[PDB]
Design a protein around this ligand. Structure first.
Ligand SMILES: [Mn+2]
Ligand SMILES: [Zn+2]
Length: 198
């Protein structure tokens, strides 16, 4: 997982979160094997967003085709250990918002963070994704990892854009403060993005 350097750097970045502010959390992949996690504070735009290689390639490929459309080959360049490091450093008794809490509860409990409380906004399925297209149009530049065609052909689920669109649904408008990542790209990825030489 992370080095001492990376652990110290991760911890400093996470202090940029406001412990009392509304915080969304969303994940892609099962809670025992997640591949994408986003923790997002709408009021100030800050978000923690990272990825993880799957242990179970069989289930991953199903999730790829029917949910997030992530290419497993893209995940080989993501930094391991972030999931446990981030969840360990979340503030004591922090309260997080989510759309469906069952999988998040298991993931947090698995990290011995039962102290973290979940507010399940429990939105109707389509009410929750009312602003999906407008969120994807404005903010899909923020995540490059959903490259496959997803079927159920629907828009793929991104943990980060899910958080953004759930917030837009609550407030009835795509008008949210500008999202801004707190993690350094060099902490999220262990090898830089390859550009096609043209
Ligand atoms: Mn999602
Ligand atoms: Zn994404």
């Amino acid at each position: 997982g992370l080095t001492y350097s990376q652990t110290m750097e991760l911890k400093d970045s996470m202090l940029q979160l406001d412990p009392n502010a509304k915080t969304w959390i969303d994940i892609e992949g099962r809670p025992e094997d997640p591949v994408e996690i986003a923790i997002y504070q709408p009021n100030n735009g800050q978000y923690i967003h990272f990825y993880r290689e799957p242990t179970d390639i069989k289930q991953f490929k199903q999730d790829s085709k029917h949910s997030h459309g992530i290419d497993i080959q893209d995940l080989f360049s993501v930094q391991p250990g972030l999931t446990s490091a981030v969840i360990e450093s979340l503030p004591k008794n922090m309260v997080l918002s989510c759309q469906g809490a069952d999988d998040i509860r298991k993931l947090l409990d698995s990290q011995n963070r039962r102290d973290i409380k979940l507010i399940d906004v429990s939105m109707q399925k389509d009410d929750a994704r009312k602003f999906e297209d407008k969120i994807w149009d404005e903010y899909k530049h923020l995540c490059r990892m959903h490259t496959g065609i997803v079927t159920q052909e629907v828009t793929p689920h991104c943990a980060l854009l899910d958080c953004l669109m759930f917030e837009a649904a609550v407030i009835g408008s795509p008008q949210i403060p500008t999202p801004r990542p707190v993690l350094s790209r060099d902490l999220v990825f262990r090898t830089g993005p390859p550009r096609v030489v043209l």
